[PDB]
Symmetry: D2
Subunit: 481 residues, 4 copies
């Protein structure tokens, strides 16, 4: 009931949700910053009203959190870098060659040493140096760092969310709806690879890209920018994000021969008795479309094979929280509320499973099933880059932690190459549109004083990290809540 020698155990974080908190560390130059400070979004209830500047303040407290992490047995951490802190001003003018196929696809972006030297002139050195400083503080402790380049926020010069909602995508800097975002992201990737390449053991181009376009252009009641309902816009954004990844991959490899992958949000799909295999297609079209393209260069019923997109997934980051259950075959399976992410805060699902403060059903088995299926589908190394639960009372986290770590063990014990488990957040943080009311930390944070408090789950985590597995004395928590 122990993991391999070099198995990575730790947690993940993002720039936007943890950095700000102490005066002077804000990043007012991103779409998300403007979006959550917007009066109309607030009045409408799209955003909670809480501010990132009142966050945990990792930008200033990094050293103390790293010590806390180390005290709990964290040996590996996955972090990101804000595009907008690195390039507050537009990088549009740094030309760079861009190869386009017959259909307008950006099959190649060439960012050479001169371009990088030029980008380095536009970059915000204070931020760049501060990132190296924070991450070097963790790495020089003899610990591993996984660096993710993108975790949602976009620079305002690239995306003006408010203007996109009022005027339409065609009359405003439209973020991922602007194909040039691909080129700019590629330049940003090369620069980071060249500047911080020595720090990480692995790279990740982006975090849950699917959530960005699904929330921003489909599930608009979720409060994600630009909140512009349009399936057409969603597909466009998805398309450019897939390209942005492929191009970022090429450019990172030019300055860093380290593994380059992608962190993705996977819900474990499920349905009726033996309805049909029409579900498999369903899953291929919505759940596995994106990772299929960036690995195989194609997807379901679509001969198209793009070489510039294929073979660009050295490892796969798995963010797992719960499941999604559907009904009916026909040609349209439908979502059943009361299951997975569609439960009530603190409630119980029809399957007798407890639900988080977010109203997400605790379902550890899904992680097990997800991992096996991913490996059979892609055969690539996997890392649980995110797994946790909104639970301010810590009434679920302890069991939730042991349950999912077990599912990971079970998968590894069966040969699945899962290289590590990273818990979502060591500390509470800014839960995007939801604000601070959603607490995922193993460590509670008083956002007024910025003090960190250990929740009992944190103690449980230390036992697991220290034992590099689940000690017999904690085997009972592989069950439920």
């Amino acid at each position: 009931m122990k993991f391999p020698k070099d198995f990575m155990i730790g947690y993940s974080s993002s720039p936007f949700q943890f950095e700000a908190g102490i005066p002077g560390s804000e990043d007012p130059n991103s779409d998300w910053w403007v979006w959550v400070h917007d009066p109309e979004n607030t009045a409408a209830g799209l955003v909670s009203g809480d501010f990132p500047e009142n966050g945990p303040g990792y930008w200033n407290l990094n050293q103390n959190d790293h010590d806390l992490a180390e005290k709990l047995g964290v040996n590996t951490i996955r972090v990101g870098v804000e595009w907008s802190r690195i390039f507050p001003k537009p990088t549009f003018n740094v030309k760079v060659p861009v190869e386009r196929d017959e259909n307008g696809s950006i099959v190649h972006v060439d960012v050479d040493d001169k371009a990088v030297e030029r980008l380095d002139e536009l970059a915000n050195k204070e931020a760049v140096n501060h990132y190296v400083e924070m991450y070097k503080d963790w790495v020089e402790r003899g610990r591993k760092l996984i660096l993710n380049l993108y975790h949602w926020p976009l620079p305002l010069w690239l995306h003006n969310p408010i203007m996109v909602r009022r005027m339409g995508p065609d009359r405003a800097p439209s973020g991922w709806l602007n194909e040039e975002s691909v080129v700019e992201f590629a330049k940003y990737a090369a620069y980071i690879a060249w500047k911080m390449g020595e720090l990480p053991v692995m790279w990740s181009t982006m975090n849950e890209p699917n959530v960005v376009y699904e929330q921003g252009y489909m599930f608009v009641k979720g409060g994600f920018p630009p909140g512009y309902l349009s399936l057409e816009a969603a597909d466009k954004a998805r398309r450019n994000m897939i390209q942005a990844h492929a191009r970022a991959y090429d450019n990172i490899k030019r300055f860093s021969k380290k593994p380059v992958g992608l962190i993705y949000a996977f819900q474990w799909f499920e349905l009726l008795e033996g309805p049909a295999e029409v579900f498999d297609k369903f899953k291929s079209s919505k759940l596995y479309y994106f990772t299929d393209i960036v690995s195989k260069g194609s997807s379901i019923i679509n001969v198209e094979y793009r070489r510039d997109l294929a073979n660009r997934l050295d490892w796969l980051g798995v963010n797992y929280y719960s499941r999604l259950v559907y009904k009916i075959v026909d040609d349209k399976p439908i979502i059943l509320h009361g299951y997975g992410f569609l439960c009530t805060p603190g409630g119980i699902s029809p399957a007798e499973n407890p639900c988080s403060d977010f109203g997400w059903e605790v379902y550890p088995e899904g992680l097990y099933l997800l991992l096996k299926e991913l490996y059979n589908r892609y055969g690539v190394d996997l890392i649980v880059t995110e797994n946790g639960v909104s639970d301010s009372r810590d009434a679920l986290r302890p069991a939730y932690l042991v349950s999912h770590v077990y599912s990971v063990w079970k998968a590894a014990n069966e040969g699945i190459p899962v290289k590590g488990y990273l818990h979502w957040s060591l500390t509470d943080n800014y839960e995007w549109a939801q604000g601070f009311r959603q607490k995922f930390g193993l460590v509670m944070v008083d956002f007024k004083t910025k003090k960190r408090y250990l929740r009992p789950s944190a103690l449980v985590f230390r036992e697991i990290a220290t034992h590099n597995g689940i000690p017999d004395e904690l085997q009972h928590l592989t069950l439920i809540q």
Copy 2:
């Protein structure tokens, strides 16, 4: 514990939520029709997915519901007429003189007999004749009818909600954002006044106009068209709706000397201990702004006195369901969740009050306080044009009904000229973006068979209507639930 001789007792309904249900009676020409059938709105969860064509089918069953109403003691009913059923095609070309002041305000719209004869040529006779037929069926029973001209849906030729959201108000037929809506509404009002003027005992220009612009341009998560977040758009719509009312009033009076008023959505505002009188201003700015203008011709801290808007409120229709509670003075009182409309479905408020299926707190005292305050503010005749509760099990309606009828009695007993009480809906209906899951009927409706079933609250209603008051034997329900 009885009301005056001619006190009106009954219920209210709207075209959109009750008419369709039987094939062939749909009105596919309004913004709301397109809006609730929209794939994206549905996927996003903005609308429930339920369809109005599966409603109660009053358009075909009117006679049966009128008998049911009569069997229950209903002596008065308030109904509406869909602008889009009357004028499916644009009325823009029927010129008509339009007087504009220096600021662009439409202070006068002259629709004479020729214009009316012309409008009558564009009108959909089948619909016009069917309305006269349905309402004549009720009136010729020796009962009273209150006719409301507008209850939300707008003709598509005037408002294309989907296009407004995608392109922006300036690139689409923008409904109330288009000042010409004022002129068109005035023409529509004159035509109805001239065509159906003999039917009603009183007129209402519109139903809860504030909900239309607040939901459509501010509280966009509510699923109201066009769902275009913009405080600027909200004020503009409000402005034109205020003008539309004033102009509709002038044109109705030209063909009908009967009382012309307005039905409005009033929440009973409340706050802390003795925080301040800054609240009064708050109420004048958000709650009483609109009815102040259409009566006094002005509002708080705004000398402006508009004669073309003042003196256009012969009676006030009061739609009451619950309250809203605030906190803090400063300069920004804030809403306290867990109170009034912000409670949980079936829950209990911090004040031990039961909450409806809609999550709205039962608070009968508010109606009492609201009526007194309205009379002292406006001194005009009042009619509770709406009062009911979302409650499919009828676990609250019986007490909810007696409670509020009591508050009205209490007010009348103290001299307040409340001329009647109309319960919201005799039967369940299509609750807009919420679909059919919200049941307000005294009578349950199986939307599959269209059959009407009496809920016990219906029996209680009959006792009240028959006794024209609250019999001693039912006095215990003036309490709570």
Copy 3:
């Protein structure tokens, strides 16, 4: 959806739970009276602490309740007579011949005219005359009365509950544990038959005798006298009660040729999938044992045939409230909590059924299944003598009423000779050890003022009684809650 012409519709009541309430009407001479006033029982929580003297006061208000009943459409009522009010003093000395078989069974008790004349000398005339007065007040209205002789309380001279618990049955007047109770009950039966024989259309010797011995000697935590845990005592009491019934039957028939039956408490038993038929035996041993003996003169695996007990069930009174669900075959089926009577107050059962204030699952289908099974088992006329629900808010009663009346209709429509439906209580009353916190009335009673208030369910009842069935307009309530 209507019952036969002469179908009986009304309600039932008992002496102890409704009579007292107005000073001077108490009956301090029964075991139950002393039992609920006992300091130790109260401190222990065996009894609630509420007093019968604070009840509805039917003894004084009978005329007003009869009018209320009549106003609601009640055409038939089932009432009882307190043994202890009729014979406050011991009747032991009125000799009377008693025939005993070889095993000590009391196969015959001869109470002739002289004995009756003698008993009439010991009887409390004021009470006897007052009963005739109350019941004559109902009957002379042209309504039916069903008279039940025993509804739990026993005279103190026959049963001293407190002394039985402290000293043991062998050192105290032990109620039904004293076989002489059979002889005394027989004398009491003849006297009532001779004295009040003209009033009722049918007789009932006793009400739910099984509850008396099961609660009093087995389920002692229920607070029933004498609360003396002993399976041996339970069987003895059951044995003498069976004899008491047979003997009472013989003696009533001597002075009244009217139908004589028994009212019984039937739970609808249920179990697993297809476990076995070992359940049938189970049911025969616990549920149908008693009514089997008083009708067939024998029971399961027990050749014994007693002629003095058989053929003494002209009709069967059915008291139905909920079900009981079991698990496992083996030789011992076990009760599953969370079902039927073992639910939580106001909760929901694993089958999505609402639960009463008593924590009893609403399950109308059980009544249907129970009636068919009873008829096939006994082939005797049946009358639902009790059916209702503890629900002070009247959140279940309306639907509960229509549901069960429907099950009865369904049974009658299929040929089952169910002669009537009597709702448990028109008004709230003293719910034995539970006190007043359990409200079963269709009419709420303020026990402080003694005023009766109609609950909406009462209105629903009137519709059913008046229509002598379930009108179409109320068909939706044949469902659930």
Copy 4:
């Protein structure tokens, strides 16, 4: 935020609830053993149906639990010895001088060396040696042991509970109702003192004696033997238990000069605003009566001063779990349900406090107030001998543990001589009549396999024990849940 150097930290256990579990270790010779195996008690629901033989099996696993305890930082443990395991056969015949005053009180029992040598001949050596073995295993680790002589079960030769209930106390071996129990207990105490005197650092004559007589003779629905409702029997048992303590104290002192005290169940009494001081008397009569007598030799309004009972409380063991709240002065304060021990499982009290699985309100402040009050009343050294919470999910224990440890710190910090804190149970155990459904362990026990699993609260306990206080990093849990 640390306790003194030699502050005792650990947990308590009892023989009956932990010893059995592995075949062959049962103690079938006590009243509790027979009582929980009784068919009638089970059918009646007086006992759960669970069996002690399926318990944790400490009798065989002691060494493993001691290691677990030590691993968690436990430095002190309080245990008991079953009277019935030591003397399975009657000790009645070992004469021994008994001094009786004028009123029959047993003021003195002389057990000399010969008597002890004789008792040692009747004692069950296997049990005696096994106890010394188990406790020596803990003590020889350099840890402290507190030995309690009585924790409820009585030998069958002294108490036949079933026979007491059926026949009455006067026709059966009536346990504490038999004054000779005083003499036998005194003999048992001298023997244990002489045989195991070297092991403990302190003695306790009995555990929560008040619960024994209150549950057994008053709150009979609780399922405690003999379940014989009688206030007269309760006072008698209380009287003899008070004497048994005094006599046990005298005889322990003869063979052991170590501190001899008593462990008691204290609820924290509370009431209205400023009702009166009639409450103080109330508390003295029910809560502090017993400990008053064994210390002062008298109680409220009762001049009587008994020298043979006074000065026999060297230290006081405090068992605290929750409070009890009353209302009204008059002459009879009454208990308010919904507070303290009268809450619902998992619910919340009217004061916003979480409630345990037992339905007991978490109220840490009570322990603080209780300790101060006890010290001011008695001025004796205090030890929290019991404190814990029924919580199988460990959703409350972590905070419950830190809260109460804080209350103790607060008391010690203010000078109150509280010498230690013992948590109720390291592991889950047999919760008497409630069976295994009530889990109080810091460590979960799978009673099927007998395996011990650490609950997160156990980890929190270790931090406290190791730090000999509440570390800053855990200060947030001194609040609520």
